[PDB]
């Protein structure tokens, strides 16, 4: 592995990314155990 | 022809035993074209005369030299690299027990042989050093200067490490690498205890030295030929 | 000393479980203060 590796060697996008990530964290059933303050 | 097959197997096994009678448990070295310095039986006297140590943070040392050269200086440098690979490579790994050393003869034209040094850090780039022997310096001092250069390179590579704590930890948890060295223990001893029998060894372990035999007191008394403050029996 | 840090990691989960339970009780008792007042 060593030998082979040495031989080989406010934007709208981010805003909508935050929107999608927050919606996922809110509506996901895996995160249903999130504390109420969070 | 079954008896002939059995005879062939016996002959092959007899040759194998003649080759590795004291060399059964160690692994076999790489069967390359430049690593001929490993399959040969090394004299322990020569290995003791050639004792050289490198920085503890290095893990791999390879040398690459061409088989056929075009220039006179290229032939000289290739001869220097070959002499170094045949003289100082095996002592380095045998006396460091941490580094893996390898030599290679490339079937091409390369007037400048080189040596690569890999440290214990996986993210750190290896150090490459070309063999440029001075024309005025003979082969002996040229090989000596090459050895000094590679030792200084290993020292720099080990001093430029990122995290010495993790370097030392991976050094501790790295297995052995000098298992392939075939050495002939000649008139010096078979086991390190008999080898260093002329020196007091204070580095021991209590649970290791504790014998586990039945009636160990009786056996130790018999071995020491010591009375043990025990009254003699009848003896009359 | 590193094995000692591994012992805390086993019980550190439960100490976090106790804090969040009261944090839920503090935020819920705040909601009923707005509903009834």
């Amino acid at each position: 592995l060593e030998e082979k590796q040495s031989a080989s060697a406010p934007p709208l996008q981010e805003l909508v990314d935050e929107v999608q990530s927050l919606h996922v964290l809110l509506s996901s059933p895996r995160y249903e155990d999130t504390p109420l303050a969070t | 022809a079954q008896y002939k097959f059995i005879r062939r197997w016996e002959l092959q096994m007899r040759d194998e035993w003649d080759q590795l009678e004291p060399f059964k448990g160690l692994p076999k070295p790489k069967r390359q074209f430049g690593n001929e310095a490993a399959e040969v039986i090394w004299p322990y006297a020569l290995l003791l005369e050639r004792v050289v140590k490198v920085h503890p943070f290095t893990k791999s040392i390879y040398v690459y030299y061409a088989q056929r050269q075009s220039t006179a200086r290229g032939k000289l440098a290739a001869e220097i690299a070959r002499s170094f690979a045949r003289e100082f490579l095996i002592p380095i790994t045998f006396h460091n027990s941490q580094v893996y050393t390898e030599a290679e003869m490339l079937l091409e034209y390369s007037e400048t042989p080189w040596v690569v040094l890999h440290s214990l850090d996986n993210g750190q780039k290896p150090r490459i050093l070309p063999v440029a022997p001075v024309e005025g310096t003979p082969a002996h001092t040229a090989v000596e200067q090459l050895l000094a250069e590679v030792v200084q390179g290993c020292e720099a590579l080990g001093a430029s490490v990122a995290d010495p704590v993790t370097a030392t930890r991976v050094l501790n948890e790295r297995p052995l690498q000098n298992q392939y060295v075939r050495v002939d223990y000649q008139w010096f001893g078979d086991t390190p205890d008999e080898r260093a029998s002329h020196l007091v060894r204070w580095e021991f372990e209590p649970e290791q030295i504790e014998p586990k035999i039945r009636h160990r007191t009786r056996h130790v008394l018999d071995w020491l030929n010591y009375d043990g403050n025990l009254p003699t029996h009848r003896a009359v | 000393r590193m094995k000692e840090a591994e012992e805390e990691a086993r019980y550190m989960q439960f100490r976090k479980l106790q804090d969040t339970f009261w944090s839920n009780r503090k935020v819920l008792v705040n909601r009923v203060k707005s509903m009834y007042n």
């Binding site: 249903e32 | 035999i213 039945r214 007191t217 | 339970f21």
Partner: protein
């Protein structure tokens, strides 16, 4: 592990031992998940001479 016999000394490699428990283990309460839409819990309480 405690010694199993007294006649044989600790020097014998064939010494037999027996395991005896010091603590049966550690236990913690079980706390189920609390729903958000139903935080209010209703229960019945039976008390005998408790204020």
């Amino acid at each position: 592990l405690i010694e199993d016999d007294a006649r044989t000394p600790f020097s014998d490699p064939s010494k037999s031992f027996s395991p005896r428990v010091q603590s049966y283990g550690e236990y913690v309460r079980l706390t189920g998940k609390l729903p958000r839409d139903l935080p209010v819990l209703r229960f019945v309480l039976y008390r005998d001479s408790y204020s």
